[PDB]
Enzyme design. Structure first.
Site, mmCIF file in Angstrom:
data_model
loop_
_atom_site.group_PDB
_atom_site.id
_atom_site.type_symbol
_atom_site.label_atom_id
_atom_site.label_comp_id
_atom_site.label_asym_id
_atom_site.label_seq_id
_atom_site.Cartn_x
_atom_site.Cartn_y
_atom_site.Cartn_z
ATOM 1 C CG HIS A 12 -1.902 -1.219 1.229
ATOM 2 N ND1 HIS A 12 -2.812 -1.434 0.173
ATOM 3 C CD2 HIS A 12 -2.063 -2.222 2.162
ATOM 4 C CE1 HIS A 12 -3.476 -2.554 0.476
ATOM 5 N NE2 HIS A 12 -3.066 -3.032 1.661
ATOM 6 C CE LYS A 41 -4.388 -7.558 -2.512
ATOM 7 N NZ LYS A 41 -3.668 -6.518 -1.793
ATOM 8 N N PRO A 42 -7.748 -8.682 -7.141
ATOM 9 C CG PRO A 42 -9.721 -9.727 -6.187
ATOM 10 C CD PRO A 42 -8.203 -9.847 -6.346
ATOM 11 C CB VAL A 43 -9.887 -4.723 -4.577
ATOM 12 C CG1 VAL A 43 -9.990 -3.353 -3.927
ATOM 13 C CG2 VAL A 43 -11.158 -5.038 -5.364
ATOM 14 C CB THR A 45 -6.147 1.476 -1.672
ATOM 15 O OG1 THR A 45 -7.439 0.924 -1.845
ATOM 16 C CG2 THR A 45 -6.296 3.007 -1.678
ATOM 17 C CG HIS A 119 -5.175 -6.487 7.939
ATOM 18 N ND1 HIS A 119 -4.699 -7.359 6.972
ATOM 19 C CD2 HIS A 119 -5.118 -7.132 9.138
ATOM 20 C CE1 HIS A 119 -4.356 -8.486 7.587
ATOM 21 N NE2 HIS A 119 -4.586 -8.382 8.888
ATOM 22 C CG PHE A 120 -6.160 0.141 2.858
ATOM 23 C CD1 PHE A 120 -7.420 0.306 2.275
ATOM 24 C CD2 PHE A 120 -5.332 1.263 2.979
ATOM 25 C CE1 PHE A 120 -7.877 1.554 1.851
ATOM 26 C CE2 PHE A 120 -5.765 2.529 2.577
ATOM 27 C CZ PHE A 120 -7.042 2.660 2.030
ATOM 28 C CG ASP A 121 -11.878 -2.261 7.284
ATOM 29 O OD1 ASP A 121 -11.704 -3.544 7.264
ATOM 30 O OD2 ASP A 121 -12.948 -1.782 7.587
HETATM 31 O O1 LIG Z 1 -10.468 -0.402 -0.159
HETATM 32 C C1 LIG Z 1 -9.794 -1.440 -0.175
HETATM 33 C C2 LIG Z 1 -10.255 -2.753 0.223
HETATM 34 C C3 LIG Z 1 -9.411 -3.801 0.185
HETATM 35 N N1 LIG Z 1 -8.102 -3.666 -0.216
HETATM 36 C C4 LIG Z 1 -7.277 -4.871 -0.290
HETATM 37 O O2 LIG Z 1 -8.123 -6.012 -0.367
HETATM 38 C C5 LIG Z 1 -7.835 -6.931 0.732
HETATM 39 C C6 LIG Z 1 -9.124 -7.515 1.328
HETATM 40 O O3 LIG Z 1 -9.930 -8.203 0.372
HETATM 41 C C7 LIG Z 1 -7.045 -6.088 1.737
HETATM 42 O O4 LIG Z 1 -6.123 -6.932 2.428
HETATM 43 P P1 LIG Z 1 -5.116 -6.326 3.513
HETATM 44 O O5 LIG Z 1 -5.883 -5.350 4.325
HETATM 45 O O6 LIG Z 1 -4.654 -7.520 4.266
HETATM 46 O O7 LIG Z 1 -4.034 -5.613 2.802
HETATM 47 C C8 LIG Z 1 -6.316 -5.051 0.871
HETATM 48 O O8 LIG Z 1 -5.091 -5.539 0.331
HETATM 49 C C9 LIG Z 1 -7.594 -2.452 -0.628
HETATM 50 O O9 LIG Z 1 -6.453 -2.302 -1.008
HETATM 51 N N2 LIG Z 1 -8.479 -1.403 -0.604
#
Ligand SMILES: O=c1ccn([C@@H]2O[C@H](CO)[C@@H](OP(=O)(O)O)[C@H]2O)c(=O)[nH]1
Length: 124
Positions: A12, A41-43, A45, A119-121
């Site tokens: 991130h 990886k789908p999503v 930030t 983690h990035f919520d």
């Molecule tokens: O707005 C969002 C939502 C999810 N993620 C990503 O998607 C994962 C969850 O499906 C997150 O995992 P991590 O917190 O362990 O890094 C984060 O990487 C993002 O980058 N942005």
């Protein structure tokens, strides 16, 4: 084998630029960071602020995480970010993303000692 903390930084953090260059930023970065190596990886930030400013969020506004846990924090002010999302036509290993640059508040989960982001919520 890489700590949770270290893993957060690698996926991130992007302090080298103030904002997304072009519409191709995502396609480039997801590859550079090795995020499309075994699957798409789908999503994801990326944050364009200093490490120190991102780590300080663990001391700002406490909120609930999406899973019900209470170790999440919301930033006091907006930050420069870039959202990357896989397109519908995308199929491994030909991974493709849509790039969206913006100024929003971030929400992260924190842990440990020292207490840093793991983690990035979401973004708001
Ligand atoms: O707005 C969002 C939502 C999810 N993620 C990503 O998607 C994962 C969850 O499906 C997150 O995992 P991590 O917190 O362990 O890094 C984060 O990487 C993002 O980058 N942005």
């Amino acid at each position: 084998k890489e700590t949770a903390a270290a893993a957060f930084e690698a996926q991130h953090m992007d302090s080298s630029t103030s904002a997304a260059s072009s519409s191709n930023y995502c396609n480039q970065m997801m590859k550079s960071r090795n995020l499309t190596k075994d699957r798409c990886k789908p999503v994801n930030t990326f944050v364009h602020e200093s490490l120190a400013d991102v780590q300080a969020v663990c001391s700002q506004k406490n909120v609930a995480c999406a899973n019900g846990q209470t170790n999440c924090y919301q930033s006091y002010s907006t930050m420069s970010i870039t959202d990357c999302r896989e397109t519908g036509s995308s199929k491994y290993p030909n991974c493709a993303y849509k790039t969206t640059q913006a100024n929003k508040h971030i929400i992260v989960a924190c842990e440990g000692n020292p207490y840093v982001p793991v983690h990035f919520d979401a973004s708001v």
